[PDB]
Amino acid sequence: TQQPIVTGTSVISMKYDNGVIIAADNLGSYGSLLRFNGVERLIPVGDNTVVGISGDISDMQHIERLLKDLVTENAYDNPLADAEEALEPSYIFEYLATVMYQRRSKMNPLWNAIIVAGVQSNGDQFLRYVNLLGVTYSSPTLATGFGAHMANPLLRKVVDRESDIPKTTVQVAEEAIVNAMRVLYYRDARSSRNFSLAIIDKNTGLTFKKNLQVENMKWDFAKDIKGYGTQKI
Amino acid sequence: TSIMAVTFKDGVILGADSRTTTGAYIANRVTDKLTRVHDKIWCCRSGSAADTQAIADIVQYHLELYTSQYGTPSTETAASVFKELCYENKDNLTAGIIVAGYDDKNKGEVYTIPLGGSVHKLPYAIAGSGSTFIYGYCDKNFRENMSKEETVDFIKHSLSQAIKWDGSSGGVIRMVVLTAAGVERLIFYPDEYEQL
Amino acid sequence: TSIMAVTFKDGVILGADSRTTTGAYIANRVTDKLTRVHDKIWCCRSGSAADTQAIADIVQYHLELYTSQYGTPSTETAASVFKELCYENKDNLTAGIIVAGYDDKNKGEVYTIPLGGSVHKLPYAIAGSGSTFIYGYCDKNFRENMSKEETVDFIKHSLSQAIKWDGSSGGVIRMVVLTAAGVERLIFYPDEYEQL
Amino acid sequence: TTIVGVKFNNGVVIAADTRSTQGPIVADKNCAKLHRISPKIWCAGAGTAADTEAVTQLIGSNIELHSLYTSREPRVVSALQMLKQHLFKYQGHIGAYLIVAGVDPTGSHLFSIHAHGSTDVGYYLSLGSGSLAAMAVLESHWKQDLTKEEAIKLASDAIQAGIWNDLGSGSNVDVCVMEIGKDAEYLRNYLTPNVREEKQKSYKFPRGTTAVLKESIVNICD
Amino acid sequence: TTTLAFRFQGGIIVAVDSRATAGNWVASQTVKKVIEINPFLLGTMAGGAADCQFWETWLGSQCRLHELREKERISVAAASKILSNLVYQYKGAGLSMGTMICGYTRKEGPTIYYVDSDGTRLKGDIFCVGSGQTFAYGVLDSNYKWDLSVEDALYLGKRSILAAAHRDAYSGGSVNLYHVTEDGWIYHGNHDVGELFWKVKEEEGSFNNVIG
Amino acid sequence: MDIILGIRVQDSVILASSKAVTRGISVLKDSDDKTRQLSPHTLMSFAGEAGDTVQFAEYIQANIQLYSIREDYELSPQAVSSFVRQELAKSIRSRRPYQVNVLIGGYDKKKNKPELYQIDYLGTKVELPYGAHGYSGFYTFSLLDHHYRPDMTTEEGLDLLKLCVQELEKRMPMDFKGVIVKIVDKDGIRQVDDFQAQ
Amino acid sequence: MDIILGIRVQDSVILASSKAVTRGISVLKDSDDKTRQLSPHTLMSFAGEAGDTVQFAEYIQANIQLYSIREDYELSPQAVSSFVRQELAKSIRSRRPYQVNVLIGGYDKKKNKPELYQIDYLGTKVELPYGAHGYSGFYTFSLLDHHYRPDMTTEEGLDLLKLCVQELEKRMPMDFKGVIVKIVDKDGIRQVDDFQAQ
Amino acid sequence: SDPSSINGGIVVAMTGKDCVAIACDLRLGSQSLGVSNKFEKIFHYGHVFLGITGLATDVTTLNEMFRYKTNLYKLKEERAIEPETFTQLVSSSLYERRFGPYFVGPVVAGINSKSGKPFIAGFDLIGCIDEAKDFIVSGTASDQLFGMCESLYEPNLEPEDLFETISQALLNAADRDALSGWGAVVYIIKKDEVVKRYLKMRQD
Amino acid sequence: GYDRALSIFSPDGHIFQVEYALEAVKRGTCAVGVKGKNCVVLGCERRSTLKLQDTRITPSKVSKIDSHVVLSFSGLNADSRILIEKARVEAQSHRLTLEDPVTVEYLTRYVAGVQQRYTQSGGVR
Amino acid sequence: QFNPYGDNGGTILGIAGEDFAVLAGDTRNITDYSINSRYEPKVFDCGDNIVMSANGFAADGDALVKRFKNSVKWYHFDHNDKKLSINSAARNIQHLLYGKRFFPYYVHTIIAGLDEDGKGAVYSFDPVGSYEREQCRAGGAAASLIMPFLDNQVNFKNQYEPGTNGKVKKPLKYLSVEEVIKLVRDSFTSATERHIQVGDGLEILIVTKDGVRKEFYELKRD
């Protein structure tokens, strides 16, 4: 049993016609102190999977080390490591889920919420969640922490059910994700303006975008607000 | 919350961020923390929003009645009324008020009433959760008798740092300038102060 | 406690106050918080004194054995050992370590290992109870590739502010300079830094 | 519960869902959450249901009496001041969280009030369990100078976000539009996107199915 | 829950209700609270549903092992002590069980053993266990005689469980009856309280306070 | 707790109350009468918290005797039970509540029928053929449910109680030292001095 | 708690133990024998925690019977009491202690003298003319302090116990359902089947 | 501990075609002990019906309070109180004890004697009104009642049919609750007449 | 730690350590037992390689396992003590769990089981 | 402090027919007041004609189902591909659950199939292994709303022959697969109306001597 110390907030994602998109800001909070700003919370595994992690940062770094090892280990005595026997998004997820559930079962969790995004070898999109309790689930859109409350509602207006996937383009999807990141920056006190975004396309491959910034913010209407009820000036 | 008041050559300026939170959620990103209790007596509130609003509303009442009978009240008198309310009710209140006003005789003045209900007259004062991060910066850069432009810059730089490190602070930076010339309302947006 | 490490043109400098308290009592006013774990790898300790000393002693042991078998360890490797100890034993430890070392290939480097056991490579780092008061000051005055004289000044000004506001910090300011030239020990007394 | 308030170029609008619950059970699938303080000052609450209703009617009663005494139309700032001073006195024990909107001789107004007695002013607000889903929508589509129609859409869209994504909300959308120069218009069940599909069977029982032990007539007349 | 067992001229009567709950929620009205350890041994269950079921089923396996090893039917004393010692090993861990081990061996005659999770083991002629025990005791104690006809005994047992099913909110469903003789136990059916109550009211004239 | 039992037969109400008064480790008295006559045809038995018990009983007695003198009339059992219920109901929401449970047995001379009322400290009232407070009910309600009949004679009622007491003396952990039995009928209240072996 | 009494007279030790076994609200049995014969001239009575009680007694019995077979000899009462004390003393510092109090009455055939040992669950042992565990002592030690004599006959001892039991049946809150009395002397252990009215 | 689970009991009301039904079980217990099988939980003032679940002492006190208030109301107004009006009276009477509440779950049923319109309403312990048109449920087996009612109910049922529906809803809900049951009574209400029936049910 | 296999099969299918154990028995003093119609008698012979013993204290050849069962033997005296002790312990354990003393066959089967185990366990003869 | 358990909502329903059995469950997965997924299968075909569902704390439900499927696999390996009878699966599951008696799988589990005589079978378990074979059983969030209904419509409780003065109980005629599916769908539309954790979709698994079939139906998404 423990308590999280340095933490990462939301991780949001959704799937479109040809792949999946996942994003997360670059902040490492220490309680209410916005302590670290160069924190990458999207972990690429090979060229078909990206693991986004929220929660305790020390545990995130541990999970990072675990993932790099899975890659090394999978390459051992494996002449097809970069082909038919390369790590699949589903293998990576099952592994982490297994670990997450064993750790909670020993009353010593990895204090995180994880989303595994990727494209399988047969083209299928892969999007699944797992957290510190070992709980898992899939949906056309997935978000952790605050994003679950404010991002899913916006992302679900684009893909409300399975049949909406093929009708959704990378452009529409990325636009929706970027808008969601802005909304989170407006109402989540533990969020940052800078974030990373990754796209896993069954055709274009893996596109990892670093140092993005929330832009086109509306603040002007603030000049007209005065007092908290009766004040006029 | 990040709030501060700074006396200078021509008077005094009050400044604040505009973020109010309930946990990690930002309940209001454009809050107005600069509260008018009299024409040229204003205050910055920190602590329980319910409490500080109730105190300010009562102080405004007391100062309106004071004015009707004895004329314009001194900033000191306004700070005294705030104090009386905060000290006598210290058990049921969580309020940290910065009082700042402009008098023609006394020019600009700043009084801080922290949690216990004690009062302190100062050249400048900072409060709120975000103030801890700018104690060093403010003590190294504050000078007495600065110009309006310099003071605005001092507050702008100070609060942008407070907002940078404190998750409970953010949004726009609001300022109120109190001089013989009148009352001026200033507002500064993120795209500006973030790149200082 | 107020501790910090700053990388610059020729390497890296570690600095700290010298006050250790048990409640309001100063148990030691001349404490030495700059701890050597290798010739050119040093660390600043914060948190439980018993804990950090035990960790440092073990890290020194690991680095001496490492050196005997594989030669001089990188600063990164030293930070890794600290981390392994802090992360794996997070339940029974209260330690905040700043690791700083000089390598001929990598020059000066700074790693901070906060309470949870995570690691962060940074241009400069501040920790300890007194660090909260200088976040704004340090973020506004730090520049990369400063000279030795400038860095010493940066640390001296930063810590004097931390000492000014934090009752848990005080005494003398100690510094350790790590460059290709060697190891230099600096000390600065109250009568000097108090009047900055 | 999901309640929202949106200011437009010549007025203000408020809306709410219609789901009332007792723990995880839906007690009323179509209750009205939009209450009237005065003809043109409307209100919506979240939290302790009995408290929002009682606090609304008390201040409403006093507002009416004040209006009659001063020969003037009720002002939103008066309802705000009376509500907040009442709630503060009770130190949060009266669990009323409200969004109050209305128009009066001085213009259009929009405020939020919390159980402890604090108030806020804004152009768009949301409250209740569905608060965050609704605000995600408002932060994405709100803009200055909305037309009456754009505001109805935005407000209605915000509540739908709550109906669909928040388990504490559902069923229908109620709206009330308050425009500067006209009467306020209450639009009960402005949207009804959750109609129960026809059941697969009829459970009407053949008469005599229930065993009776004794029967008798009850006297109502005195 | 209400369970009872008593010794008399014709052997042993065993009666139990069949209600299972989870708080005020009635989980089931058709639970078996008597497990046929084996053709000559019966076990009753009260307390934790799982605890009783799992360990009494386990008891049967241990009793069968004894017969294979010793080429002889296990005694009621040895059987009850197996469960008793097992339960004692777990003392303090939270097991919850109130049980009766009833059997008939040539060597001991009709025998009843009360065994609970506290580790208590008692041999006796009459036992009522469960949230409804006091209600059964009331009816059973005021109509008991060592000289009851197998027919009259079966009724007293059935009547006692009924009494408890009526007054105890946590007891009810139906009554399951058993008669124990040297040649084994004899099931005497399942009697739904729904019909049993009215029948008994009319034929006996009791429960005069309820209107029917 | 103490034993408080009541049973309404054909033409009377019988009240049985334990005689022990136990404080901690010692039985201080074994002839305690846990009853007060409220009026010539109304009797009340009580059990509960140490001091509140008698203080409540005596308070109710005083009020009824006052009503009797002022009106030169005797309130019906139902009227008295309602008065007692209101008093207990007021008490449960006061600074320090009377923790007292009672049984009221009375013979209504106007209806010519015996009546038995059971009221707990919360002000919970119910009229019954037989009643009990505390743990007693757990062993007696099933007995009475079995052996009770509306047309029983005062004598059959006494044999029914004897049966109840024997069950209590067999299964209950505490030694309540027997009971005092009183009969309430058209002729008033009398005490059966011979129950120690009837 | 249960009643455990012991008294050493001129040529024997008398043990008296209550027969009730009560669980919560019900008296489950009223003929419980709270004793185990450790050897032909040594008897042990016990009271305490529900399951631990018998488990401890039977465990001690097994060990002594084993010693008897291995050596073809009978350990003296003092030896047995010391063995029992060590077991209880080990138990108090273990994961889950035996919460059992015991009285050991034995007749030492080598000294030709009866002996009575009182040992509580902590391993506290003392040799006495008379003893008791639980609340019993609070009413019996003053009685015996008054009526006891070293030269009493087994018969005078039984009359002394009868006096103790009567006091317990008068002042103690719980109904312990009488006692079973056993005598330990030069001829072994016998049970006085007639104490229900001696 | 929970004042609302000490005595047990349930109440349910339904509207039909120009009629209304209000029903309740008869149990009154003390935790696991069943004490009385004749504790009715429905009362009426004129043609207005009130059912109350929860702590028995408050059930009784509230009935006496409303008898008291409706009696004065009639004397002053010179007419019997209507369903809608009485509902407001219950609500305001309950909120008056906001910080020292009666632990009950009131239910109102009746027909406006002037508009002929059927009416029902429910409240939480401090007065919040639940004005559903179909049915209102209250008591220790409220989850069960919601389940039955939602499944069995259908609009505009005739008195004779509504009776079968309300009864089956009550009975089967009661049988899955340990603190409910032990007898039941159903009231069928029409502008002109009211019939009361006692149902036969499990006695365990 | 010592677990060498001392009792193993030889090419002809014999286990010499068991066979030689029997030779140790042939060397032991003679013991006999005869059962009557209502009794059983056990007789043993006493060596004479040395005579000047104290019969009171010298361990006898017949041992009580429980009040109703006895055991005699031929072979190594020291080894017999081990079996006798285990048998005595098992007899008390049986009374403790079954609430009935052991039957003679049960006690025999137990002693025999111990002997068999020592023929196929590592490190023991 | 760390709480090892969570509640994911959901409701499941099992009904046994004369020569078939069904196991249904909504497809919504939740946490507090948010929806995690509108379609997350909760009922599984485990092989050998056995369907299972462990509802409550999803992580525990998944571990159990996973462990049982693996048990079936090893049963084949160790007993010459013998088919695992439903009664045997039930006992196996009891040991799986009781294995964690001191750190329980926080689930209410139901399995369905055909017994060895070809009849429909349903078994329901306690979180720690207590089990019983039954005619029907609802589990999860809305079990308290559904079970009463099933007692009435499946076992005809409290229903009598009209005109017999409640003297003759309605006969126990048995239901067809079509009639059962109707009860299931109605049970879920009702549950979706009154319980905030139930909705989105309904997935039913039917077991006959020919194998396992699946049917899917939409449910209200509010």
Side-chain angles (χ1 to χ4, degrees), chain D residues 32-216:
Chain D
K33 302 182 186 183
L34 263 37
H35 309 310
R36 186 177 69 257
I37 294 239
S38 63
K40 302 180 181 183
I41 299 4
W42 290 64
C43 208
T48 312
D51 284 340
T52 70
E53 177 65 41
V55 88
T56 273
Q57 289 187 295
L58 178 60
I59 273 56
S61 172
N62 283 309
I63 269 304
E64 181 171 332
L65 291 174
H66 182 267
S67 186
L68 257 20
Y69 185 105
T70 61
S71 295
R72 288 175 168 66
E73 294 287 69
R75 300 192 184 185
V76 183
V77 296
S78 287
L80 190 74
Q81 201 84 335
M82 290 160 92
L83 284 165
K84 72 145 59 183
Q85 272 164 35
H86 177 70
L87 293 172
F88 183 81
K89 179 173 57 184
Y90 282 96
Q91 292 289 305
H93 293 302
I94 291 188
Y97 297 79
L98 319 162
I99 278 194
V100 58
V103 296
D104 60 41
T106 73
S108 75
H109 311 277
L110 184 57
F111 303 115
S112 67
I113 313 135
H114 290 212
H116 283 274
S118 71
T119 51
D120 268 308
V121 36
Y123 286 102
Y124 53 102
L125 310 164
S126 65
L127 291 190
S129 48
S131 172
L132 277 68
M135 181 58 77
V137 169
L138 301 174
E139 285 289 21
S140 297
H141 303 303
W142 185 89
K143 65 171 179 176
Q144 218 153 186
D145 289 312
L146 290 160
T147 60
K148 168 181 179 167
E149 282 75 16
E150 295 182 303
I152 305 293
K153 227 285 176 178
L154 182 55
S156 194
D157 281 354
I159 301 224
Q160 280 198 66
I163 279 133
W164 305 132
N165 308 100
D166 165 48
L167 295 186
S169 303
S171 294
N172 313 134
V173 180
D174 284 354
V175 178
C176 187
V177 193
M178 287 145 279
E179 197 163 9
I180 294 283
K182 319 194 301 172
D183 283 351
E185 53 166 344
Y186 177 51
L187 309 175
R188 173 66 163 156
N189 282 24
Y190 172 71
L191 272 182
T192 53
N194 282 299
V195 184
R196 184 218 230 295
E197 63 174 283
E198 180 184 353
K199 286 204 290 286
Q200 215 66 23
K201 182 177 181 294
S202 178
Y203 296 96
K204 193 171 181 175
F205 293 90
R207 301 185 184 177
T209 300
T210 306
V212 167
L213 289 172
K214 170 172 46 188
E215 188 178 304
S216 60

Side-chain angles (χ1 to χ4, degrees), chain B:
Chain B
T1 280
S2 299
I3 55 175
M4 71 190 293
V6 190
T7 62
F8 71 105
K9 185 184 170 59
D10 307 334
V12 67
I13 306 186
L14 288 76
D17 74 298
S18 66
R19 179 172 295 191
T20 53
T21 57
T22 49
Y25 182 61
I26 309 206
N28 189 339
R29 61 187 183 88
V30 298
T31 313
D32 179 10
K33 309 185 183 178
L34 301 183
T35 307
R36 203 215 88 149
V37 287
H38 200 67
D39 300 294
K40 284 174 182 173
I41 310 322
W42 290 56
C43 70
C44 302
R45 301 172 295 102
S46 76
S48 162
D51 289 344
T52 63
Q53 283 181 13
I55 279 130
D57 286 0
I58 292 180
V59 172
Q60 182 165 48
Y61 162 75
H62 271 282
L63 298 184
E64 196 175 70
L65 189 49
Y66 180 95
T67 296
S68 290
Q69 299 177 75
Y70 329 110
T72 299
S74 67
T75 301
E76 195 190 24
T77 282
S80 180
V81 176
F82 264 105
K83 180 241 181 52
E84 206 71 357
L85 293 173
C86 291
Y87 178 69
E88 233 52 270
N89 299 291
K90 59 165 64 183
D91 289 351
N92 318 298
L93 298 178
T94 308
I97 309 328
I98 298 306
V99 182
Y102 176 87
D103 183 63
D104 206 70
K105 188 288 174 56
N106 295 294
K107 187 190 293 181
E109 295 189 320
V110 172
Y111 297 83
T112 188
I113 297 84
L115 253 53
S118 61
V119 214
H120 310 270
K121 189 172 182 305
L122 301 170
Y124 79 97
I126 67 294
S129 58
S131 66
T132 55
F133 307 118
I134 50 137
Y135 267 82
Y137 183 76
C138 295
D139 183 77
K140 300 290 285 184
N141 291 83
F142 170 81
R143 296 162 280 136
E144 245 152 2
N145 293 137
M146 293 169 57
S147 65
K148 172 187 171 191
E149 323 141 297
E150 295 179 306
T151 298
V152 166
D153 282 356
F154 172 57
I155 287 163
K156 189 151 61 179
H157 275 67
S158 300
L159 294 190
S160 72
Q161 272 298 132
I163 292 174
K164 182 165 191 174
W165 302 109
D166 180 39
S168 294
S169 297
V172 301
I173 292 180
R174 294 184 191 286
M175 295 195 212
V176 169
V177 186
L178 275 40
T179 60
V183 180
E184 192 187 0
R185 270 260 188 186
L186 301 175
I187 198 288
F188 296 104
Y189 308 99
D191 284 293
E192 174 176 358
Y193 77 68
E194 281 187 9
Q195 241 52 74
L196 288 172

Side-chain angles (χ1 to χ4, degrees), chain J residues 148-215:
Chain J
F149 179 60
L150 263 35
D151 290 329
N152 188 229
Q153 295 296 307
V154 172
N155 297 299
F156 306 126
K157 297 293 185 54
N158 295 112
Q159 275 192 280
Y160 291 92
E161 281 302 312
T164 62
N165 193 198
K167 290 289 175 294
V168 188
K169 308 215 305 291
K170 174 178 178 171
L172 297 175
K173 190 184 65 55
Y174 224 95
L175 316 183
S176 60
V177 58
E178 290 81 21
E179 191 52 45
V180 160
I181 297 301
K182 284 179 181 174
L183 295 179
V184 171
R185 293 186 63 188
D186 273 1
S187 285
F188 279 84
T189 48
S190 287
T192 304
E193 288 295 287
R194 297 291 171 170
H195 197 112
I196 65 166
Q197 307 187 324
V198 182
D200 293 321
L202 170 65
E203 189 162 289
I204 311 154
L205 271 61
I206 298 90
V207 184
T208 58
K209 60 181 170 57
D210 305 302
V212 183
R213 175 175 86 262
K214 284 156 63 178
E215 290 187 11

